[PDB]
Amino acid sequence: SAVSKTVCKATTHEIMGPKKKHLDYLIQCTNEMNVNIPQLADSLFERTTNSSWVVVFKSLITTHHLMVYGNERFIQYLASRNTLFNLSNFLDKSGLQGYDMSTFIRRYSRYLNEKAVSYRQVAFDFTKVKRGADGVMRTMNTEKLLKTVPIIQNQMDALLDFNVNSNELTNGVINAAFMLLFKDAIRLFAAYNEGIINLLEKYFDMKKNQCKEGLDIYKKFLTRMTRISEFLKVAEQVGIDRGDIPDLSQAPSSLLDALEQHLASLEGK
């Protein structure tokens, strides 16, 4: 009940993101093994049944914050559910602000759903695993890599589909969501990029059908890069510390012709 009470405090009608003090409490909750994760999640789900965009959006932000900063047993539990958020028809018509925010609530809930689905499918969180030449994405074997990168790609699509303009970030609730989306985006991009580095190191030794898969992955990566650039430009326009924006220039983006020529040779007599 203390947990439920704090979920309520994190999700009041006040037009601002959940307060740090309540988020910090709920993080600590996830770290105590005696805490019942399903009951904490149920409280969050219940708030998403509220008619107010403010309450619903704040419950989603709280859930996202806990996925990012909480014990891994939290996202593990969300990933175990058959269904997560069901907000595809959400609409708060109480006012123009409610209309505006309803669209973003639908898109944000879809992203969190996909974040849980990604975790269910690969049994780790792309945004939090070890990086580098010795990290998870860089060391992954061929079969697993070909399976995994499309999952990253699907998660990134759902994130980018939030599709907000800088001039739409006009209240503290949506701004709070955006800051967490920004953090996930740069971390998810690093995983995507490492997956592609790995793919390119292996591509010219793969089987014909593996190369077809790899080439599809690469073409899709190139178009997502363009979208990620657009998303970072929104972050730049709104004022985010430029030192926090990653450099996309080092993504290995000039290999299309080589990949195609190699596959073409495999498809010849």
Numbering used by the authors: 20 to 288
What does the paper say about this structure?
Here, we show that the R-SNAREs VAMP8, VAMP3, and VAMP2, which cycle between the plasma membrane and endosomes, bind directly to the ubiquitously expressed, PtdIns4,5P2-binding, endocytic clathrin adaptor CALM/PICALM. X-ray crystallography shows that the N-terminal halves of their SNARE motifs bind the CALMANTH domain as helices in a manner that mimics SNARE complex formation. In this study, we provide structural, biochemical and in vivo data to show that the internalization of VAMP8, and consequently that of the highly related small R-SNAREs, VAMP3 and VAMP2, is mediated by specific, direct interactions between the N-terminal halves of their SNARE motifs and the ANTH (AP180 N-terminal Homology) domain of the endocytic clathrin adaptor CALM. Thus, CALM:R-SNARE interactions ensure that R-SNAREs, required for the fusion of endocytic clathrin-coated vesicles with endosomes and also for subsequent postendosomal trafficking, are sorted into endocytic vesicles.
Attempts were made to crystallize a complex of CALMANTH with a peptide corresponding to residues 10–41 of VAMP8, both with the two components free in solution and with residues 10–41 of VAMP8 appended on the C terminus of CALMANTH. While these cocrystallizations did not yield the structure of a complex, they did yield a 1.8Å resolution structure (final R/Rfree 0.182/0.216) of the unliganded ANTH domain with two molecules in the asymmetric unit. In both molecules the positions of the first ten helices are identical. The CALMANTH structures presented here in conjunction with the previously published structure (Ford et al., 2001) suggested that residues 265–289 of CALM are not integral to the ANTH domain but are flexible and associate only weakly with the domain's core residues (19–264). Inspection of the CALMANTH surface showed that the elongated patch on which the ordered short helix 11 and preceding ten residues of CALM sat was hydrophobic in nature and of the correct dimensions to bind an α helix and was thus a good candidate for the interaction site for the hydrophobic SNARE motif of a VAMP. In order for a small R-SNARE VAMP to bind to CALMANTH, helix 11 of the ANTH domain must be displaced. This dissociation will be facilitated by the fact that helix11 is only poorly associated with the rest of the ANTH domain (helices 1–10) and may be further modulated by the C-terminal tail of CALM that follows helix11 binding to the clathrin terminal domains that are displayed on the underside of the polymeric clathrin lattice (Morgan et al., 2000).
